[PDB]
Design a protein around this ligand. Sequence first.
Ligand SMILES: Nc1nc2c(ncn2[C@@H]2O[C@H](COP(=O)(O)OP(=O)(O)NP(=O)(O)O)[C@@H](O)[C@H]2O)c(=O)[nH]1
Ligand SMILES: [Cl-]
Ligand SMILES: [Mg+2]
Ligand SMILES: [N+]
Length: 403
Amino acid sequence: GEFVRTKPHVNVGTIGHVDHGKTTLTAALTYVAAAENPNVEVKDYGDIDKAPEERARGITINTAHVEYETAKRHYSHVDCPGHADYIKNMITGAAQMDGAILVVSAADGPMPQTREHILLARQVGVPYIVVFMNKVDMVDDPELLDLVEMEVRDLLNQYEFPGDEVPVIRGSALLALEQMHRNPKTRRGENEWVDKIWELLDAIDEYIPTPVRDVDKPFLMPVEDVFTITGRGTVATGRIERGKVKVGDEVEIVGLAPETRKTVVTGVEMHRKTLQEGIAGDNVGVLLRGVSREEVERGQVLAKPGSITPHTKFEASVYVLKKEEGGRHTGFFSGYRPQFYFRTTDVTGVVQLPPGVEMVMPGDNVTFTVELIKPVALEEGLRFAIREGGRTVGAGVVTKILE
Ligand SMILES: Nc1nc2c(ncn2[C@@H]2O[C@H](COP(=O)(O)OP(=O)(O)NP(=O)(O)O)[C@@H](O)[C@H]2O)c(=O)[nH]1
Ligand SMILES: [Cl-]
Ligand SMILES: [Mg+2]
Ligand SMILES: [N+]
């Protein structure tokens, strides 16, 4: 059908260590919110972890986007994988969030991807975090619960989140989800577990602010994914960063290719509902005429033509992680070629250290230049993560664009 705007729109999502309950919580949110609002369509566990490879491996691999709303706001929710091998997908998901829900298992406490997701969330600009302490149905001991909360708050403090202030909601994603399956009409106040999900919804409503967005600046949408719709054509998905897009607009596909390509937008949808106009903050699919899925990819940006010049060379201020933060034990030299993550973009780059700086060590704050092997939409003040060999090794911010 058609998308009707009645409420402010905010993008949230789920992050946290593997198996702590992100997807189960995402499902419970749709069911719980749907009882109050009939515009919410429910999403089961298997509707979210739907890919054959997810069924095969028993984990989330792809980000999934689901929709729900409260009385206050409309939400698009990006559910990210927790497995260490799918961090790149999680980063692309977090790059779309105005706030993240950090899921931590009460039975396990914070674990290495609890830390890594918090760190990475910051580096793609997630401005606020709410915590859901999950699986409390498995933990009798009140003292362990208090310890887990304390550990999570302190961990958040380590990455410059206000850990002492974030809401920490204690519940069971699974028992809420079970109650909603048995009674899909279960309303607030009727059930203990469902009410914890309402506590989460209230915290999301009130603690994660609606961002200040600019719809007057040139259209810019980082591409998070691309697929072929049988019948329609190639669709590029993403959160619109600024400006607006309408069907009929010419856009440029910028980055990751030798040259920029122009095409015409032939459709705009949010959660499979047609948008008259996509605006900053919307989580959309943009149908692109005359390009295949081999001609658009994650990490490119769609932009008002001529508004963005992609770049390959920049100076950066970089913090290199210590080993206890999951970084490398050893340093690196000029010529080090790790991966750089900017918003939804993942690209290999060459580190070139100043003359006289021959080695950078874990724990170092340092400045150097990077040469990307492919051009990428970049700008001064843009935060990024550095990863190599399947581990996060650094966090940086672009200081100067050289080329
Ligand atoms: N006891 C209990 N088990 C739960 C709860 N929530 C989830 N689980 C169980 O925990 C396991 C993982 O749940 P899942 O939602 O897939 O976690 P995830 O964080 O999405 N995993 P991934 O990191 O791969 O995406 C499942 O076996 C699920 O049934 C809960 O509140 N209580
Ligand atoms: Cl579309
Ligand atoms: Mg999952
Ligand atoms: N998924």
